[PDB]
Symmetry: D2
Subunit: 259 residues, 4 copies
């Protein structure tokens, strides 16, 4: 029971990877702050956390709004009595060739994926420094944060930027006893990849379905990633056994990118 | 005379590294499109190019304005009769601890250093694809694009993002015969580093002068970098001898970051 | 709990990091095959494992002997009824300037650190494949397998080699259901660094104290690593929460090398 | 022009990439020390160098013999009146699955590819230091020194080792005014890849054709590399435009490995 007496906050917690993370951290002992954008789906996840025997707080928030993130996270931490782990999971993906990326498009993805991570690090680090907590910041990165991919230039740019922020924050926050690491998933099997494939097809002229299949064919381990696969590594990063790890952006990707 | 009959465009060309690049490319044979923000200093650099025996066009431009960059670069290319090399050199630096970075601050540095590079790649690639030119795109990156540094989180984030964009664009533009690479300088000896040191001191309590000295002490080769050091490698990247190199972000840094 | 029913083998198990690893895997549920070079100290460690209610086989072996390692590992796996996890921990260190490295010296460290890892990988994967088990190979790498360190040319070369073999093996063995990863510790012992620091001053004219400050006081977390820090991450890599991770060489180094 | 007055040594100079390198350095102005294993083909290459109005010394040597390499290089440097540039080009390749690599096999490739590079570095740096020259050591690395490739475990391990020794040597020799870098070609010959592709299918159950497509048709630029591509970058690394570059292992690979 690694996380007994701990409090973890997770962004994008209502579904997908963030939900899996929230539930895994709750199973390992933590009370959970669930942040997302739709109250009704958040409330459902909150009940599943409470069913596992933990306390949950479920609040809508815009991770791209610096001051509101800070205040909302502080409200939730006050309600539960602390904060020990911050998982900056929420992000968005875009698909567009380098030549066709437009200004509003790229401003939008940076606002969510880069500023939103930054604002969450700041909100959590502020709270940690208040009680002298040896806190953990855990950011969502990607295989696309280690290598730039075609048609994913904007997304890759934001995940490289999250890696940068991970490193700079690890170095600056170490003297406050706060570690900062990222997790880098591969191909996580979702309806989302069906959407990516569709777009990719219309852009290129390949057959619908072909691109998603070809990507899966590339994974050394021969299967797609589950949200629980990602959650298992986030659980390690949340634990005492990661105390001495900081600044790292670790691939759990089935053998796609090798570092 | 590697660049005879070639046309190169350089952003931030009026001074510093961009000026050194412009002059070196002109010495190697190219006619030069000089882009920057002050007409009077641009005009001076233009005259030095013309003194080396080349043609120059010198135009003010805001690299963060997508459509204006495209049209201005096109005007200059029409005036000279082509475009073969695009050097996205201009950028800005900020100094601020991770916890204190503000929304307008980070929007500003991304607009210049990330969007501005993107818009220049798009402007140049459009022109190359018009005549079937085997063009070269060369982006300014940094040691801070390979490792995140303390107090340089925003800057590092933008240079990691430029590396991403370099990779994704190299992969997507290869079939058009266009290569995309970046150069990554170290500590380039300038009044700029005196300013960085000053800020860093006020933030931390170290002595004015101490931080710049300590950084120089770190360079394996034992001397600071000159703008001509950077220009020499940009000259290689502009040449035939770099035809088979694409997607790379190469450190010319005196032995600071090792990849 | 985490490794209930599993059997693990660990080289260099009698003392040090390897003993910590062995004891942690036993605490987590695994019976252990302890391999090292001195029977008396192996026997002591086996008794600690047995006191946990775990089964232990303790056998002397030379990791650099391909055929002997194969047969000794197979003998132990037969005794215990299987083999799930192979930790290639044992290795040696040498401190010598690049210019002074001699033929017998470099052959010795490659024999132990590179051939020894390869022979272990071969011994364990032969067992996993002949039985059909989904096994895990876990190799000891280092900060020095990610960056070459002064006076550690030979050691760094061997650790880089280990990372290469981790990646090639991960790619080749994935279709047999076998994962291959490495763990990369930072600075555990400090005496070697005093030595290195002195010798760096003598051979390059660095100041005394300055290399030790750079590397030992350069650790972001501000403390040296313990054997338990290392064993904690090895326990993660042994666990089902690492099932989807392959080909990786992960730094648990207190913030020294950033990837 | 670029290397006027310089003297360079190149191993594997009789044929192939090493002959291209030798001829390019001669064209650029350097007298050349040609080192290889067969006197008759060395003599032919020396005659091509001499036809340029350059001086050549052609001597047989075994790069894996430390003392002999030292004395033969010194003999040649004395004949020509100095030594400025050392290119450690010669190496061998092997294709073998990780599980099947044998002791004499791996010892052979490490002897040639790792010890041979180290002995060359030592032979040249001894000369540079005893005379006080600011020399350049340039080592042959590979895509396989940045990522481990299937069936190329041993070769990849040696090339990773070469990158380590490049970095350690760069750090140790900088204070003597010596730079150390590596060049990392991609895919030049295609026959080896057909072999690898077949053998991958046999050992992992991949489809025939699928490995060759992944690696050979995965080159972004869409064509294999020539010896001239490699020699062009080696010419840059020999030149004063690389003075500030040290510790680097640069990919000229058509867009295969992205760093």
């Amino acid at each position: 029971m690694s996380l007994s007496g701990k409090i973890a906050a997770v962004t994008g917690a209502a579904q997908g990877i963030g939900k899996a993370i929230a539930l895994r951290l709750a199973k390992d002992g933590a009370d959970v702050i669930l942040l997302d954008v739709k109250q009704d789906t958040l409330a459902e996840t909150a009940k599943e956390v409470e069913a596992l025997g933990r306390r949950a707080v479920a609040l809508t928030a815009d991770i791209s709004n610096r001051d509101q993130f800070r205040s909302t996270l502080a409200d939730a931490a006050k309600t539960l009595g602390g904060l020990d782990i911050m998982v900056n999971n929420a992000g968005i993906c875009q698909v567009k060739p380098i030549l066709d990326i437009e200004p509003a498009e790229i401003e939008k993805i940076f606002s969510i994926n880069v500023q939103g991570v930054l604002w969450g690090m700041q909100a959590a680090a502020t709270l940690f420094k208040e009680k002298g907590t040896k806190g953990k910041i855990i950011n969502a990165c990607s295989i696309a944060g280690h290598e730039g991919y075609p048609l994913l230039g904007a997304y890759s740019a934001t995940k490289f930027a999250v890696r940068a922020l991970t490193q700079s924050a690890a170095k600056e926050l170490a003297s406050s006893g706060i570690t900062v690491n990222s997790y880098c998933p591969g191909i996580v099997g979702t309806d989302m990849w069906v959407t990516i494939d569709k777009r990719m097809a219309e852009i290129t002229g390949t057959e619908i379905g072909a691109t998603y299949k070809k990507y899966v064919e590339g994974i050394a381990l021969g299967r797609v990633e589950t949200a629980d696969d990602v959650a298992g590594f986030v659980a390690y990063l949340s634990s005492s056994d990661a105390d001495y790890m900081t600044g790292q952006s670790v691939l759990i990707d089935g053998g796609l990118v090798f570092r």
